[PDB]
Amino acid sequence: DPITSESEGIWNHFFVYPMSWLITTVANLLNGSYGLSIIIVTILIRLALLPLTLKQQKSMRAMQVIRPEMEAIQKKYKEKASKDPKVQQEMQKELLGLYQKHGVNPMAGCLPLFIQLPILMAFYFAIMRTEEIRYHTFLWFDLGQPDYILPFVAGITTYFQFKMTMSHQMKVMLYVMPVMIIIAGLSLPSALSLYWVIGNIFMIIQTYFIVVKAPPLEVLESSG
Template sequence: MKKTSLFIILIVITITLSGCGASQQPITADSQGIWNHFFVYPMSWIIITVADLLNGNFGLSIIVVTILIRVMLLPLMLKQQKSSRAMQALRPEIEALQKKYGQEEQKKDPKNVQKMQQELMALYQQNGVNPAAGCLPIFIQMPVLMAFYFAIMRTEEIAFHTFLWFDLGNPDPLFILPLIAGLTTFLQVKMTAHQLQGPMRMVMYIMPIMIIVAGITLPSALSLYWVVGNLFMIIQTYFTVVKSPYVTTEIGK
């Protein structure tokens, strides 16, 4: 499974769980379960602590903590992108091997499957590439991002505060935040669309729609989180992917 596909599937699962009302009970220090006690509650505590430092402004707290988490995860993101670039550089040679040991050749001699795998592994070793290296950062990032997501949903104090023109505990009455969240999601996915193959490119249009629909029905605090996270990722992608000479030709296709 492609790393990008896996990342998108996990995001869809998160949105689906929240929309179905999963795990919406208020999070406290007494909440039971490993996920609640060691993941969601610490994130909730950080949000509350930062809000206290900012004179009780939970909107600013969400912005600050979102940026801090993204900065902390940045080395993992860069490692993931480095792995993706390395795999892209080897793509012509990988495709040549796949063509050499195509289905017809595999039917003639089942051992050709093993030969192809051996040559692929030799190719990876010669170039110092680990095809599984790009997956590990995702599995580390996702629990952190999901815990923060659910912490925003389940921190009771957030619902009693306002930020700018909206109540953090209610949907944006003007739909401005959901629309911005959808637009920034589209821009973020479009900037990395070269990594999507075939039908997966439809994600570029499906994901923004899902975000907008979710933003219209869910608390504005979540839309605020999506907007800030998307803006950070857009800036990060611009400097680490779009401006990179290694992927310019891919993006231009």
């Protein structure tokens, strides 16, 4: 009550207001087209996050490099009776030390989640607060009303997105998350699905044209 309303100002001024501003600005430039506005603004955000994404894909690919060391340390503890919290903690400590020495962050895998969630919520809030969108229609769907086709499209492109990024826990992201996206998409305004679809397509095209190269082992072992 005293400071929970103080966070309202932070959430509005720093997240919702700018997000809501981007949508309305582009839409008014394109003659009230909020459909094309959502598309362009989404691409704009994905463009600003492009260098950030590259740094993350580099970290993921760096983890693949030290996999022989991850395999070896696992073997050392595999033959021993594990599963117990005492032996499990020992493995975690030895595993973490491998990441530290080679300058690799295992938190890189769930890092995009920390960045997407605020943007997703900001987009959703900006859409709902903007009253002049619920009557706008794009293609075959209403921007303020749920759709029965778009959520399925969003689930396929989400699947394909993860499909390309995963080079030669894994099962959850590509087989559980896409169906969970579709379910959520059906119970949410079509604006989010469209927003999600474009987001996926951007990532798919990016991964196709821009491939991150794996850092040499020499680079990792020479970490400060």
